[PDB]
Write a protein that binds this ligand. Structure first.
Ligand code: CL
Ligand code: CL
Ligand code: MG
Ligand code: MG
Ligand code: MG
Ligand code: MG
Ligand code: MG
Ligand code: MG
Ligand code: MG
Ligand code: MG
Ligand code: MG
Ligand code: MG
Ligand code: MG
Ligand code: MG
Ligand code: MG
Ligand code: MG
Ligand code: MG
Ligand code: MG
Ligand code: MG
Ligand code: NA
Ligand code: NA
Ligand code: NA
Ligand code: NA
Ligand code: NA
Ligand code: SR
Ligand code: SR
Ligand code: SR
Ligand code: SR
Ligand code: SR
Ligand code: SR
Ligand code: SR
Ligand code: SR
Ligand code: SR
Ligand code: SR
Ligand code: SR
Ligand code: SR
Ligand code: SR
Ligand code: SR
Ligand code: SR
Ligand code: SR
Ligand code: SR
Ligand code: SR
Ligand code: SR
Ligand code: SR
Ligand code: SR
Ligand code: SR
Ligand code: SR
Ligand code: SR
Ligand code: SR
Ligand code: SR
Ligand code: SR
Ligand code: SR
Ligand code: SR
Ligand code: SR
Ligand code: SR
Ligand code: SR
Lengths: 73, 46, 237, 56
RNA sequence: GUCUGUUAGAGUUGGUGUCCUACAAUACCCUCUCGUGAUCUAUGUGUAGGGGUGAAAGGCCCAUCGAGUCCGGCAACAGC
RNA sequence: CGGGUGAGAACCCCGACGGCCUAAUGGAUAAGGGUUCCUCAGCACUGCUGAUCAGCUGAGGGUUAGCCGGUCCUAAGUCAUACCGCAACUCGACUAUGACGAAAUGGGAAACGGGUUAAUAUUCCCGUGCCACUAUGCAGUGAAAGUUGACGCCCUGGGGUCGAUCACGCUGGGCAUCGCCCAGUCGAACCGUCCAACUCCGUGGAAGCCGUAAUGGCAGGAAGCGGACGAACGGCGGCAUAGGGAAACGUGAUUCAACCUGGGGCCCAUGAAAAGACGAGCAUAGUGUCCGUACCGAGAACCGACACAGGUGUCCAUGGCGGCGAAAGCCAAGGCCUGUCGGGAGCAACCAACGUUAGGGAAUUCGGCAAGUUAGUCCCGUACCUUCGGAAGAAGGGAUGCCUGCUCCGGAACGGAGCAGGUCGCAGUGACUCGGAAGCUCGGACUGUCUAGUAACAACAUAGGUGACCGCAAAUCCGCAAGGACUCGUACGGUCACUGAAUCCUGCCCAGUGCAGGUAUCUGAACACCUCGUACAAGAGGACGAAGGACCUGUCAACGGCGGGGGUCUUAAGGUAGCGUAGUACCUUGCCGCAUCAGUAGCGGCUUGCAUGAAUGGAUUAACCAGAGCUUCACUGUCCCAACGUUGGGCCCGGUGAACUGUACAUUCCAGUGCGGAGUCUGGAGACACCCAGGGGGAAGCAAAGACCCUAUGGAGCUUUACUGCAGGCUGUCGCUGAGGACUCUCACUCCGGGAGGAGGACACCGAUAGCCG
């Protein structure tokens, strides 16, 4: 997480990078199969360690709040 | 540096041009190469 | 005085140009003879330098391989389609007319055939609202009600990379790296920190603009700086 | 670093060279233009009335 | 865009040291700062004078800059 | 110190002894130079002295390529032609085409080893090998899908060569109380062959096992077993009764640059293109042209006027000891005594750069400036504060060598961690290398930037905060135009500005100014229209009335403002939370306190603030800092107060050999005088001439037609509601421009579309003119 920043940058900034980076690196469930083996491969790019599936999605998380609206609409 | 065939002909000429005035010309003219040059003290074109 | 920076910009020198020779591809919609019948397969996902957002590489039936303005949710192997008879699913492209009201769209054309102009940035999206035989009302990311020709093509879904803005740059160095990929001169020196000869707000023993910051819209380039034709300023009121 | 002597040491770039058209060492090999006769820029020979006094 | 570091390399706080018809029209020595990054660097390439370029010092654009250099206007004008 | 050559020798050469250089003072090269390279003969010139020497002079000579570069390819980008613009071009943007653009250091068909010369050398020669094209013959009908060229940053595993080291053997050398020490022990390209990793297939059947340095893997089929594909500049065989060596002409090992092949992590950052190659056999033969090739590459061959202590790219980063080390120090290979004047004097004064100083210990000084103190490593231990990361190597304390014999970790190291006993010194990181520490306050959050050449900071930047403009036929900006940047961009964008991390917050004011919206009425130009005038025209007046203004409204994280009087007045409001004698407080060394023998300092408090105050941001703040101030401990020649010593100068001698400065005269001194600041005038005094050394009192010393100040109907940069104008924007009108105060239409014209056609439309664009802003 943010520990790599030491005492530089301050609370707010170090905190948000942590939040963002933790959700960012959680085990995410692959949409093709159902296994939570998704690791980010770059900005907005996600891939499944299991099925090899490669998807587009949020920058720091595979599904944006409004990315989910589309399914419904 | 690398010299082209032409640059070589020129440098070549500048070398020959850098000679003594024939001993005999000084007699014929009853008593200097004003274009005499030195590699270090002077600077050729190009 | 000397021309201000915004004037050096126009001359379009290297310092102010975008690294085009490093950019991948305009993501304008593919053109279809007609009757749709155009589908392709997503062969790979790539990073778009010019937009800090992912983009999809598609292989169409007729053997044409092109990068596409990818919405969120496109994955390798998936099948996309472009045409009127296109199935109303995320990643497909069809005239605003064939799109059901209430559906989120992106990369919307301004004029049928231009290949898309609106809603192409990360996570953004236009909401299609009204239909008709003459006009299709779309709500653009700025919240503006846009009246478009129902023949204007669009993609269903929101653009990939949402929330890119949620995370702070934290350090100048990070900013630096992104800037190095856009047509932008960075960092920024406040005009008020310049000599009078370099900018309207320059000079003075202590830094402070020597005039009100709200400039008229008819102000000439070189003088038009600060808050341009502002309708108001501040937060109060 | 001073602008004088220190900065002269960095000068080993070749620009002006013998010009195929006039023979002067004025052909800028990076610009490919003779600052003397204007070879590579003008089919006409580089002339200017200021190269001499106005009434001469 | 972490730390120590004369690794390479980049720089220069103090000595108001040495030098100041110099080794040098910006040099020498010790101390000092940076040294995985907004880093340093070679070559190539682009931007040109009321114009560039400038993390802005009116800084830099070949020892030249609050408007480069060359020649021309020109034998400028001055009540000094 | 000897000797050689020579007319002549400190510095040209030989030997011995003595030294210097180790990322360079060694090796190879790029740029640049251009013959500086080799030989002979010279010394008038050049050379910090001399010269027989030489980068100097004279005369000759020297650079050899199918396989090393160029050449070929394309990069940012450049030009030429066409098109269009421009009064015009040698000028100008776009779009087409073509070409150009990489010599160390992007891509790329092919060469190694040895020998040879005074000077060349993968080029000549010897041996061996390889590539391309073509021809012929055989084979082959496959031939273009695909692979390659072709790629970022960080961590890391495995394969593995050179090197280095260890063991033992062989050859040679050295030393001589010992028995150690040194060198060598060789051998390429190429041809063949082996294959780890990755990937995959068969078998198998794990429901907790497999695997790693780490992550990880699996019934969507783990381990195990077999198999396909498959690496090195690497191993092995040939090459090689080639070559090289006086000789021997090794074998094993460890650690392993190169090279090869994997695994992991990161991105608001995504890490070239093209030619070409493979895909696609073998023989034999022929062809392989053109250009570069010397030398230097630097404290003398480059740039800096110089044989300049400066500047100047690449690689040799694995030679030995040392140690963490590409550190110091010492030493090899290799190079050098040319960072090129010498000779004398215990060699004075004085200066540079140093060593050592008793007692005192910052008393010195603006200031501990300068110097010093501390120091490596291990163990113990470590405060306030804090954004919980840090602070922290806090502080403080202890240990440290050698020798003998061992233990533990590991496969092992010539790796690491410890134990017991012995023992020397004043001192064991013994040299070298190698932090002094602590507290308070101010500032900027931090890394970062800057005045090339007096400023490194508190200034600029920054992330973060905020406001503004714009839906893309946009906003902003460049161009006279043709056109263009932004833009392979589209509001999670990008333009224009302010503030400047985080934390707590950010009050009141729209009167003036600015911007914006609105507007009955008022005002508001030109064209057209009407009236008067004129046989016409000039002209006078009228009607209409765009933007603009008057008027109204909105807006201060717009410009800015938040006082004086009394218990409101100006000019809208009348200073809220904070903070406060401030980097802002004149008075001022404010008053009280702390600290000192004594404190215009510093800190804390008070605070009426001459003249603090909230994004002209306020307060506050951990971390950071060659930033400003203060205090303490430690230490010391900073000082009391100076001394002695070291090296280089200084002084004497040979040689070389300038410059600054010069109206004249000139041995001055004390007084006076004088345009009031005299070696030169007056009156006295003193004064024999010349030379050496010295520190600089005077010559209002020398240096630069004072930069301060004033003056000139001088100059320039900058400002603005100075004067006058010019671009630019907005707006009306005429032309383009057409049909049926308001409307429909299509046919010019505009934009979108490959096209059909679609959207718009007499508007807009463009040309002209007028009003406003400027
Ligand atoms: Cl950004
Ligand atoms: Cl691994
Ligand atoms: Mg932001
Ligand atoms: Mg700024
Ligand atoms: Mg300034
Ligand atoms: Mg200034
Ligand atoms: Mg200005
Ligand atoms: Mg400020
Ligand atoms: Mg300000
Ligand atoms: Mg040679
Ligand atoms: Mg020398
Ligand atoms: Mg005193
Ligand atoms: Mg063991
Ligand atoms: Mg203070
Ligand atoms: Mg700072
Ligand atoms: Mg300076
Ligand atoms: Mg900001
Ligand atoms: Mg406020
Ligand atoms: Mg003036
Ligand atoms: Na020369
Ligand atoms: Na000498
Ligand atoms: Na070593
Ligand atoms: Na106001
Ligand atoms: Na000026
Ligand atoms: Sr020179
Ligand atoms: Sr487009
Ligand atoms: Sr297009
Ligand atoms: Sr100002
Ligand atoms: Sr407010
Ligand atoms: Sr250079
Ligand atoms: Sr030309
Ligand atoms: Sr002419
Ligand atoms: Sr660092
Ligand atoms: Sr100083
Ligand atoms: Sr010193
Ligand atoms: Sr100086
Ligand atoms: Sr450091
Ligand atoms: Sr003149
Ligand atoms: Sr002589
Ligand atoms: Sr020589
Ligand atoms: Sr070429
Ligand atoms: Sr190359
Ligand atoms: Sr690198
Ligand atoms: Sr290894
Ligand atoms: Sr050579
Ligand atoms: Sr040098
Ligand atoms: Sr040696
Ligand atoms: Sr000499
Ligand atoms: Sr002693
Ligand atoms: Sr003191
Ligand atoms: Sr004192
Ligand atoms: Sr200690
Ligand atoms: Sr600088
Ligand atoms: Sr803040
Ligand atoms: Sr107002
Ligand atoms: Sr003297």
């Amino acid at each position: 997480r943010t520990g790599r920043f030491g005492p530089r940058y301050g609370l707010k900034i170090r905190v948000r990078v942590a939040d963002v980076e933790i959700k960012h690196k959680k085990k995410h469930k692959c949409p093709v199969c159902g296994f939570k083996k998704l690791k980010r491969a770059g900005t907005g790019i996600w891939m499944c360690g299991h099925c090899g599936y490669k998807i587009a999605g949020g920058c720091y998380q595979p599904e944006t709040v409004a990315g989910k609206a589309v399914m419904k609409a | 540096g690398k010299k082209s065939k032409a640059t070589k002909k020129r440098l070549a000429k500048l070398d020959n041009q850098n000679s003594r005035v024939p001993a005999w010309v000084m007699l014929k003219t009853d008593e200097r190469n004003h274009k005499r040059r030195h590699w270090r003290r002077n600077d050729t074109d190009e | 005085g000397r021309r201000i920076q915004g004037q050096r910009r126009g001359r379009g020198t290297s310092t102010f140009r975008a690294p085009s020779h490093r950019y991948k591809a305009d993501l304008e919609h593919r053109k279809v003879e007609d009757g749709d019948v155009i589908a392709g397969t997503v062969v790979d996902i790539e990073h778009d330098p010019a937009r800090s957002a992912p983009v999809a590489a598609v292989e169409f039936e007729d053997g044409d391989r092109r990068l596409i303005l990818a919405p969120e949710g496109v994955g390798v192997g998936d099948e996309l389609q472009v045409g009127v008879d296109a199935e109303i699913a995320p990643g497909n492209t069809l005239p605003l007319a064939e799109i059901p009201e209430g559906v989120p769209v992106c990369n919307v054309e301004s004029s049928p055939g231009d290949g898309g102009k609106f809603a192409r940035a990360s996570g953004v999206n236009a909401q299609l609202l009204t239909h008709d035989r003459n006009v299709a009302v779309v709500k653009l990311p700025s919240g503006e009600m846009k009246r478009l020709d129902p023949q204007c093509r669009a993609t269903i879904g929101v653009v990939g990379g949402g929330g890119r803005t949620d995370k702070p740059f934290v350090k100048a160095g990070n900013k630096h790296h992104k800037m190095k990929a856009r047509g932008t001169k960075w960092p920024n020196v406040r005009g008020v920190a310049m000599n009078a000869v370099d900018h309207p707000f320059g000079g003075g023993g202590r830094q402070h603009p020597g005039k009100p910051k709200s400039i008229s819209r008819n102000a000439p380039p070189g003088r038009k700086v600060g808050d341009i034709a502002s309708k108001r300023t501040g937060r109060g009121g | 670093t001073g602008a004088g002597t220190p900065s002269q040491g960095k000068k080993n770039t070749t620009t002006h060279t013998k010009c195929r058209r006039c023979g002067e060492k004025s052909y800028h090999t990076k610009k490919k233009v003779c600052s003397s006769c204007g070879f590579g820029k003008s089919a006409k020979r580089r002339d200017y009335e200021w190269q001499s006094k106005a009434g001469e």
